[PDB]
Design a binder for this molecule. Structure first.
Ligand SMILES: [Br-]
Ligand SMILES: [Cl-]
Ligand SMILES: [Cl-]
Length: 381
C-alpha cells in the first residue's frame, strides 16, 4: 500500500486529525492544522509559478514552517533539496549546482549564493497563505522523485542521490522491533541535509505520532536533555557522535525514551554496554545509508563487531558471494534492495557503478552496492 508522501500524509491526518503533529518551543500544531496549512501553502507555491518536477532547494532553520514547506513542496510534485543551515555559502552554491536546483526557498534571503536559480522568501510566502486551500494537484506515484540528498563523491564533492516517494513513504509502516505507533514522540535533531533526518520527520508524520523540533543551530546538550524530558520523547534517533557524547556526559537522558536508535558508522561497542546497563530503554544499533533513503536495519543490544540486525519493512539486505548466492561463515559483500533504493545518481553511468540488478528469491531485484565487506542468522559489517 505504498503511496506518494502527500497521499499517505492525507490518510494519516484524516485518521488522526486531533493528534499533535508538531511542537516547537510553545507552538503545538495538530495534524488537522498541519494539513490545513500545507494545503494553503501548496496553493501559494503554485501562484509563484512552481510546477511538477521543479528542483526546489530549502534553506530554513528548524521551525514548524520547515516541515510545512516539505509537505507543500511534495504535494505540488516538486523535488526537495534540503540544505544545511549551519554551512557557509561557499558550499551551498556547490550543492545547488550538483542538484540542478532552479529555485531556493530561504528564511534569510540576504545570505544566498549566486547561480542559475530564483530565490524565494519563506517568510513572505508564509504570510501570503490566506484561507485558500483548494487547488489541482498532480497524481503522484510512489516512484516519482521526492527529494535529492548529497553523498560525497570520490574527490570529496557533493554527489546527488535522487530519492523516490517510496524511499520515505515506507517509514509510515510500523517497525516490529520498535513497536512504534501514533502514540510515540520523536525529536527532530539530525540536519535536514542528511538521510538520517528522514527517520525522525517521516516515522513521525506518516504514522500519526508527534515530532518535537529541536532549536536551530549546533547541539546544546542541556537544552536537548530538557526537551527530551519535558516533551516526553519516546523514540530517540541519535547520530553516533551525539549518542557517544550523551553516554559520556549524561547517560540517564538515554533512558527517558522507550527506544534509542544509534545511526551512522559503527560506534565503539563498549559505548553500547555502558548505555544498556544504565537503564530500561531499548538500545538499537541502526544501519542507514543515503542510497537507501533512510534507516534500513536495526540490531537490538540485549546486554554485554555490533551486527546490522533486522532490516526494516520492505527492505532486503543480502551478503552476496562471488557466485551471487547468499553467503554460507562465508565472507561477502553487503547489498540492499527494496522500497528504500534510490532512483539513482545524476546519470545512468554513475548509477550503474553502485546499483545493479541481481536475481534473488526468484525475482530480479535492484540492489545498491555498499562496497562494505560482510558475512553472517544475522549480518555484520
Ligand atoms: Br565511536
Ligand atoms: Cl537549523
Ligand atoms: Cl540512518
Amino acid at each position: 500500500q505504498l503511496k506518494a508522501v502527500p497521499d499517505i500524509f492525507d490518510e494519516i491526518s484524516q485518521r488522526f486529525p486531533d493528534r499533535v503533529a508538531l511542537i516547537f518551543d510553545q507552538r503545538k500544531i495538530t495534524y488537522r492544522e498541519l494539513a490545513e496549512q500545507c494545503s494553503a501553502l501548496a496553493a501559494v507555491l503554485q501562484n509563484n509559478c512552481l510546477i511538477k518536477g521543479d528542483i526546489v532547494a530549502i534553506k530554513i532553520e528548524r521551525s514548524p514552517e520547515l516541515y510545512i514547506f516539505m509537505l507543500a513542496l511534495m504535494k505540488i510534485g516538486a523535488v526537495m533539496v534540503p540544505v544545511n543551515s549551519n554551512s557557509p555559502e561557499r558550499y551551498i552554491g556547490e550543492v545547488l549546482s550538483a542538484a540542478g536546483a532552479r529555485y531556493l526557498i530561504s528564511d534569510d534571503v540576504t545570505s544566498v549564493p549566486g547561480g542559475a536559480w530564483h530565490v524565494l522568501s519563506s517568510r513572505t510566502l508564509i504570510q501570503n497563505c490566506t484561507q485558500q486551500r483548494s487547488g489541482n494537484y498532480p497524481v503522484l506515484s510512489a516512484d516519482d522523485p521526492a527529494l535529492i540528498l548529497m553523498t560525497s563523491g570520490s574527490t570529496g564533492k557533493p554527489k546527488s542521490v535522487l530519492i523516490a516517494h517510496r524511499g520515505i513513504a515506507r517509514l509510515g509502516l510500523p517497525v516490529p522491533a520498535l513497536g512504534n505507533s501514533e502514540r510515540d514522540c520523536y525529536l527532530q535533531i539530525a540536519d535536514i541535509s542528511f538521510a538520517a533526518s528522514a527517520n525522525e520527520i517521516w516515522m513521525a508524520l506518516l504514522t500519526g505520532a508527534c515530532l518535537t523540533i529541536a532549536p536551530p543551530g549546533l547541539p546544546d546538550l542541556m537544552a536537548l536533555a530538557r526537551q527530551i524530558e519535558s516533551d516526553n520523547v519516546t523514540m530517540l534517533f541519535l547520530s553516533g557522535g551525539l549518542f557517544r557524547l550523551f553516554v559520556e556526559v549524561s547517560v540517564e537522558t538515554l533512558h527517558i525514551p522507550d527506544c534509542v536508535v544509534v545511526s551512522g558508522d559503527f560506534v565503539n561497542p563498549r559505548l553500547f554496554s555502558v548505555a544498556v546497563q544504565a537503564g530500561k530503554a531499548k538500545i538499537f544499533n541502526g544501519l542507514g545509508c543515503t542510497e537507501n533513503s533512510a534507516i534500513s536495519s536495526l540490531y537490538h543490544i540485549q546486554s554485554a563487531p555490533v551486527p546490522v540486525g533486522t532490516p526494516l519493512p520492505l527492505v532486503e539486505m543480502v551478503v552476496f558471494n562471488e557466485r551471487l548466492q547468499p553467503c554460507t561463515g562465508e565472507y561477502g559483500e553487503l547489498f540492499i534492495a527494496g522500497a528504500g533504493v534510490a532512483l539513482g545518481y545524476s546519470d545512468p553511468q554513475l548509477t550503474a557503478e553502485r546499483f545493479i540488478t541481481i536475481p534473488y528469491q526468484g525475482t530480479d531485484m535492484l540492489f545498491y552496492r555498499t562496497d562494505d565487506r560482510a558475512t553472517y542468522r544475522n549480518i555484520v559489517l
